[PDB]
Design a protein around this ligand. Sequence first.
Ligand SMILES: *[C@@H]1O[C@H](CO)[C@@H](O[C@@H]2O[C@H](CO)[C@@H](O[C@@H]3O[C@H](CO)[C@@H](O)[C@H](O)[C@@H]3O)[C@H](O)[C@H]2NC(C)=O)[C@H](O)[C@H]1NC(C)=O
Ligand SMILES: *[C@@H]1O[C@H](CO)[C@@H](O[C@@H]2O[C@H](CO)[C@@H](O[C@@H]3O[C@H](CO)[C@@H](O)[C@H](O)[C@@H]3O)[C@H](O)[C@H]2NC(C)=O)[C@H](O)[C@H]1NC(C)=O
Ligand SMILES: *[C@@H]1O[C@H](CO)[C@@H](O[C@@H]2O[C@H](CO)[C@@H](O[C@@H]3O[C@H](CO)[C@@H](O)[C@H](O)[C@@H]3O)[C@H](O)[C@H]2NC(C)=O)[C@H](O)[C@H]1NC(C)=O
Ligand SMILES: *[C@@H]1O[C@H](CO)[C@@H](O[C@@H]2O[C@H](CO)[C@@H](O[C@@H]3O[C@H](CO)[C@@H](O)[C@H](O)[C@@H]3O)[C@H](O)[C@H]2NC(C)=O)[C@H](O)[C@H]1NC(C)=O
Ligand SMILES: *[C@@H]1O[C@H](CO)[C@@H](O[C@@H]2O[C@H](CO)[C@@H](O[C@@H]3O[C@H](CO)[C@@H](O)[C@H](O)[C@@H]3O)[C@H](O)[C@H]2NC(C)=O)[C@H](O)[C@H]1NC(C)=O
Lengths: 346, 346, 346, 346, 346
Amino acid sequence: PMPPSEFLDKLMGKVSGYDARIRPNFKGPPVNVTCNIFINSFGSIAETTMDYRVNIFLRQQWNDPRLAYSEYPDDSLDLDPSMLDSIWKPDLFFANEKGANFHEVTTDNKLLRISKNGNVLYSIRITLVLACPMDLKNFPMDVQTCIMQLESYGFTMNDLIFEWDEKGAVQVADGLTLPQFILKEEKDLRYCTKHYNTGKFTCIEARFHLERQMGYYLIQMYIPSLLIVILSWVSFWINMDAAPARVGLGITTVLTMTTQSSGSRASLPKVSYVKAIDIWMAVCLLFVFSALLEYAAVNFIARQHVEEMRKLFISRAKRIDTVSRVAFPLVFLIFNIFYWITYKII
Amino acid sequence: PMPPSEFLDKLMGKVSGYDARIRPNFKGPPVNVTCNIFINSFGSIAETTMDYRVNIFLRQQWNDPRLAYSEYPDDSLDLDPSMLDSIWKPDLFFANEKGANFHEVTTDNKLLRISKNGNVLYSIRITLVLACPMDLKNFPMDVQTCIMQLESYGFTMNDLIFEWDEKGAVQVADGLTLPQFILKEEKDLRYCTKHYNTGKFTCIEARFHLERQMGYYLIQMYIPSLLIVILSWVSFWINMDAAPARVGLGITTVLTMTTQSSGSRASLPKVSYVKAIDIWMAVCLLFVFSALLEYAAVNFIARQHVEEMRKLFISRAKRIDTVSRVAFPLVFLIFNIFYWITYKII
Amino acid sequence: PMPPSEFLDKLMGKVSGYDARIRPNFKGPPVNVTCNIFINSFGSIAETTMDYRVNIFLRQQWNDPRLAYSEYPDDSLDLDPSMLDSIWKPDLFFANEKGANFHEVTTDNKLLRISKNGNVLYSIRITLVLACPMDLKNFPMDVQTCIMQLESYGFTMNDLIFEWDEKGAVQVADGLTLPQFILKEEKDLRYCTKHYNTGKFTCIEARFHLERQMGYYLIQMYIPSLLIVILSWVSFWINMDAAPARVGLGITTVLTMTTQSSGSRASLPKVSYVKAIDIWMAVCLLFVFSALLEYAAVNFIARQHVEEMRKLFISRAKRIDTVSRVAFPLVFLIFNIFYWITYKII
Amino acid sequence: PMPPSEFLDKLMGKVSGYDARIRPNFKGPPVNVTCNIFINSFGSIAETTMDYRVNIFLRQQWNDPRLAYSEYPDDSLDLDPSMLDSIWKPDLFFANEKGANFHEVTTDNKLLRISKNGNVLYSIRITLVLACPMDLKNFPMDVQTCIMQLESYGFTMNDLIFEWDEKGAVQVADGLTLPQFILKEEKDLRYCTKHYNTGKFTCIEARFHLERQMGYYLIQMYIPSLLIVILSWVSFWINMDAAPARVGLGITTVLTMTTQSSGSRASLPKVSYVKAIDIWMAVCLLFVFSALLEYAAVNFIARQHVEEMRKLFISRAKRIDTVSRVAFPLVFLIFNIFYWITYKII
Amino acid sequence: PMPPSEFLDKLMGKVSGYDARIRPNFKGPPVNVTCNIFINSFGSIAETTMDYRVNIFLRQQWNDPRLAYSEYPDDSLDLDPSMLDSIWKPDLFFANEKGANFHEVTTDNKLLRISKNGNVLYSIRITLVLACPMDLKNFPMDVQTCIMQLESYGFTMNDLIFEWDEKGAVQVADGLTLPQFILKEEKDLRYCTKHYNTGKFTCIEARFHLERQMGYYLIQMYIPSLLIVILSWVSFWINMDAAPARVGLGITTVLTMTTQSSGSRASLPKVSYVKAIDIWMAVCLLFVFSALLEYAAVNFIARQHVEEMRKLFISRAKRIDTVSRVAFPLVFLIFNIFYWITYKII
Ligand SMILES: *[C@@H]1O[C@H](CO)[C@@H](O[C@@H]2O[C@H](CO)[C@@H](O[C@@H]3O[C@H](CO)[C@@H](O)[C@H](O)[C@@H]3O)[C@H](O)[C@H]2NC(C)=O)[C@H](O)[C@H]1NC(C)=O
Ligand SMILES: *[C@@H]1O[C@H](CO)[C@@H](O[C@@H]2O[C@H](CO)[C@@H](O[C@@H]3O[C@H](CO)[C@@H](O)[C@H](O)[C@@H]3O)[C@H](O)[C@H]2NC(C)=O)[C@H](O)[C@H]1NC(C)=O
Ligand SMILES: *[C@@H]1O[C@H](CO)[C@@H](O[C@@H]2O[C@H](CO)[C@@H](O[C@@H]3O[C@H](CO)[C@@H](O)[C@H](O)[C@@H]3O)[C@H](O)[C@H]2NC(C)=O)[C@H](O)[C@H]1NC(C)=O
Ligand SMILES: *[C@@H]1O[C@H](CO)[C@@H](O[C@@H]2O[C@H](CO)[C@@H](O[C@@H]3O[C@H](CO)[C@@H](O)[C@H](O)[C@@H]3O)[C@H](O)[C@H]2NC(C)=O)[C@H](O)[C@H]1NC(C)=O
Ligand SMILES: *[C@@H]1O[C@H](CO)[C@@H](O[C@@H]2O[C@H](CO)[C@@H](O[C@@H]3O[C@H](CO)[C@@H](O)[C@H](O)[C@@H]3O)[C@H](O)[C@H]2NC(C)=O)[C@H](O)[C@H]1NC(C)=O
């Protein structure tokens, strides 16, 4: 017999009237193309530009009666990736590409096989940098949901319809790990049918829940953010007579805590709303600032102190020192409870 | 009958004398091309290079009598995006491109349909990085106006005219949100007809008002910029005898405020004029510097103090301490009123 | 006779039925392609994106009976790199490309020679940026293993099989040096046969062990990380009466050590687990923090001190000063032993 | 009649012997090509790499007798930008390109019109990143001169000559503003004829004077650079008995001034010569360092002070304090005059 | 007669049997191609990636008897750069490209002329980013030697040999200046013949000595690195009774010197060996650390001081103060001599 390359020349050549500019089943029902992606590499999720780089295998399957051969004895004929400009292909595109490219390492990474009944498998490797609106109302304890939509651009709903297959619409790699987030096993599948001034177009999308890993932020901006508050608590255990001791403590600590506040949003987007890490530094900033005002109240009584009425001012300046050793270690603990409970339920 | 691919070969082939290098209605009136864009993604507005990345759908509509078919029973014939090099297309370009590229993810993102009367719709996806002169006279409270002009390069006014359509000249996406700014619903539409040494060319543009969100700057460079001034106010409530207490306070605070001034223009363009954030740090720098000179005036009187005339110098050195507790908390409030009123009207 | 260019036109032209879209030995055994790479340049191994740039010479050898000439008197015929689109080539690709490109400096860097029996050598220069999961459980003393897999995309196992040659499967350059790591002479060779929903494909890979050089981290983040702890030890040799001396020492040192902790993960990925450099700064942070609490215990006894019972409190406040000069210099040495032994065996 | 597309096929087709590989007026005088650029966008002038990005409209005009039509009734025939590979074009190139690209947004931005006498206008949009040797002998008050040369590569002087036109050789945009520098209205026009081992080639260039705007540097690195010196002057108004007051002032200020010196060359090229900003920080570093040595001379006399001869040492230690309040405020003013006069004339 | 474009069609057309896939002098001696480069732009030598960007004019000259015309009366025929795909060209490539590109600004920057005897000149503009192993054993006083090799990829030694010409093998631009380094006039020329598993290939290279300019490092990291040591010397001229004076001096200076050590390797590669700038900061770190231990020895004697034996401890605590004023100013000078002598000979 003849090889599949010469066998398909009768179906993709000048004979049989086959044209790559004509969609299958013309003047009839639209083409129902089913798609399924395979995430190979994931990560590099930046927040300054609010985008993430993904590498998926976009599989496409449809039905073309013009390529339904019945003379070849086999059931699957592989095609050279250099002959993709001869058959019709869906005009699939993403609405959040923001720059993309293919891979042509020694061969155009394309897969093309034709079944006997007319099933055509089209799998290619695409490297996308997808964008998603980052919701940072609770930055250290948020559940991001970055989606990706597959719309049409040249054909409307009556000519091309995208759908998901029931046999693993979205597969995940075996050893796919992320440096900062984690990929949940549950991925939603809903439609995203858009409507413009020209018409209506099909759209398919899949939700991806990306939960953060609190192990990183808990060590860098939570343990040092708590030890600095302890530095302001040791001033109560120091005598009220040493002026340079408690003054230098209430100033060097209250100024190095601002660096922690400025160092908590160094690589974060400039959002207007307040996040969960801005209420942890601001409240702890009040503790390192109230300790400065605490010494300002103790030193103000000692500098004012008549022999009987002045002996009570010394005890009054020391009575507040007996409560500050218990108030702040018990008030900061109350805020430490309302913080790790409210942001663990919402 | 015959498919539209073979039907349009009579209108785009060697027959009928149709050439892609000839504009419609030659030796007559110019081609009136109407355009309308659809902003899909917006943001990433940097200030060091004074540019912003945009992703729009550039729709183009004109009239070509050479493509006015009258035999096909339908009213809209979709075209393959691979056949855009056969018909005439307007030479539309932007005067502020500064690098651009198309999107060819599995298909050239182009839309092409031809009506019966000769209406040709041309919609493509372009990713532009547009530039605009940043007016930073009031940096935290400015209303930026970044525009984009669509000029001609090969045809003059007598051969190609660009205009805006009245049915939604500029559409906005449904869920288009910006991280730093906000997009106003009012967009101006005016002409930008340029004149060069070669001739005159058409030009269409649309204004985009981008108001900032003060919620970000109010927390990072306004709350810490005010608490440092309070650190210089607590020196008045400290006795005038402790030298290392008030000296270290008037130096560590006046030097950490300069870091806030240098940290306020870390990612800003090097403009010559003064902005609204440079007058907030410089005036607050005077308060943290006047407190240093305030102790220099109190300590200078105590070191100079004859038994009757010296008792008044001690009261004089304490009389200024009774006014500094009221002057600065009431003078900084006056500047706090004139600042948030002048920059809220202009 | 005729030159090899005209001699091979009979084997690569329209005659002999040779087609570049047909794999050798069709309807029979699969093509056994042996590959061997030659690493020219290596390094630039970043950790923020977890990727490294490599430049190898990908050699490919297979058997094509359709190109087995028997009339030319020579044994090796060199081919012009501009004629690679006429013969069949394996669709080799990498599963961790993440962007790649060729080199076309004055000539496409391709090698093509055909033997008499049908051996075809295919060598090209590819610049890859390969990714690997960075295991940073012990950051300064880890042995990274970055691999690279060569999979198929268009042909399954029954049509294309990749294998390694026994004569130097992976060669190393003569003067290939790395700035940070070192390349070990032992490189493992194992298979990576994947299985997808479409079928099974061949895969070959080679392990690369990249041991770090501790000479860099030992000087920058280990010598200064130890001298700061010595600054907290000198407070014991200072009299317990000078308050501003020991207070300023226990605060300026405990706050500059946090900068060393924040400066140890400035260009590191945001991992959740704790690494070996996070337990060296945190434990040393306890020493510079216990010295602050040590003075808080000595000053608390002196401020409390009845004529006979008060003379023992002065000796008690000095007895701890006689143990702190020996405890911390001997407790930090114990942690210094358990650290450099546990992380030198695992 | 026939359209210009079919009319010019007789002049650009196989007939008439017109070839795009032959320069006009062969075996005779060279082609005198006149050029004129139009700067659209300017700025982004970095100093680390010593380059600036420019966007100009390169117009080219020459004479081609082979295209001198005499049958068409019009005087200017516009050409499709897709037919630039049919006529001869000058091989113009820049000697300081360092990477460049064109703009192909929906159309190749090319202009091509042919006059009756043979005048051919060629205007294209080129985005260049031009380099210039940065002369930073006086960094805040220099007048940079970045030029751009247009050389030939394939034709020598006897075959191609570039010249400037007298009617606006270099035009400037109407609203072209720069963020840091300013563009002067005077632009020099001189030749740059080079000589290599192959021969001599034509060259045209234009000088661009880029004066800096001192409004930026005067606020960031000149006002804080002067207030720190004032902090060292207030130590003279403090009593000579307070040791921790004047010691901490002469150390915290002398160390934060070094940050201003290191912060003045953070984004500057590593040049060997000294600039005008390195002599302003180094001299001011002497003032904040002489104040430290001033207290070292006052405290050395007080610690040495026999009942009559010791009373003069106290007055001697205070006599220098009466001159330091007048010397430094009058010596720093002398350097402040010689600085803003020498660098305002050269 | 006929123009050179039509004259060379007889030598580059279907007639005469000329093929671009055949090297000259086949079945005979190899082609001796002589090359000579012309460095136009040089600099941008980074150290994090260990690469430098260069822009050279790669001239190539060989002998092709098939192009030896004898009928044209001239001696040099210029060729259009669009016809380089018709003649044979050497497959020259660099072994350290790491990404490269050509320049196509309005014309492919290629030079092609053919002599009567068969001499063919081939000059193109290539922008390379070449790599070299940075030897940083003495960072401020090293002599870097970055080379560039021109190897073959498709032809072995018996088919293509590269050589250097004796008439200026490597030329330098007239006004080529470097921001950091300097280019020496002496450039070595040696061979780099490599040997692989396939065979042996020709190779030509040229050495480039790049000496650093010490004027930059001497001001930024050598003058401030010496003044901080002077701050530790002034503590000896202060009385031994002021505790907060000498304690704060021996801590604030010893901690700001570590920033100079961390600030000396901010943009340097992470090498394991010690460089010449790491022994200048570490030794100076001992001086600012020995001054802290010097006060720890003086204060330890004063706190210990029986009426006759205690008067000698006061003199002993002051005797070391009389030697420290002379020891350190004379020991640091000894290290200052051995440093600037050992690194000025090797
Ligand atoms: C692609 O998928 C669409 C569905 O999304 C298919 O369209 C549906 O096709 C049926 C005929 O097969 C149309 O008729 C209906 O038939 C059912 C019985 O199956 C009957 O109960 C209904 O009353 C109706 O007559 C139906 O209108 C149509 N639906 C839509 C929304 O178009 C289409 O056939 C598929 N195309 C191919 C090539 O498989
Ligand atoms: C494209 O749009 C232009 C307008 O911007 C159209 O041009 C105008 O066309 C009219 C004829 O239709 C020209 O004549 C005028 O007619 C009015 C009555 O409608 C009459 O009152 C005037 O006195 C005049 O005779 C008019 O001069 C012309 N204007 C310009 C500025 O060119 C043009 O026809 C449109 N082209 C197409 C193909 O639709
Ligand atoms: C490519 O390599 C494969 C092996 O990976 C070759 O396949 C093996 O080929 C033999 C025949 O040569 C097949 O038959 C076996 O022969 C042995 C004797 O050599 C006999 O003991 C066995 O019982 C069996 O009959 C064998 O099944 C086959 N193995 C596989 C896994 O396919 C193949 O021939 C190679 N192709 C070329 C073109 O060299
Ligand atoms: C392109 O420009 C060059 C000048 O840069 C033109 O060349 C000059 O052409 C004249 C003839 O037109 C040559 O002859 C001279 O004529 C003058 C009178 O005009 C006479 O006084 C002189 O003694 C001499 O005979 C002249 O040598 C030549 N100069 C050079 C440097 O080539 C050239 O003609 C222009 N080409 C075109 C096509 O316009
Ligand atoms: C390209 O350069 C090579 C040299 O690198 C040329 O090869 C040498 O060519 C000579 C003949 O011209 C060969 O023969 C020798 O001749 C000398 C007298 O000149 C004689 O004393 C020797 O005993 C020997 O017979 C020589 O073997 C050969 N050397 C090599 C290494 O190949 C070659 O001819 C040049 N090609 C062209 C086209 O110019």
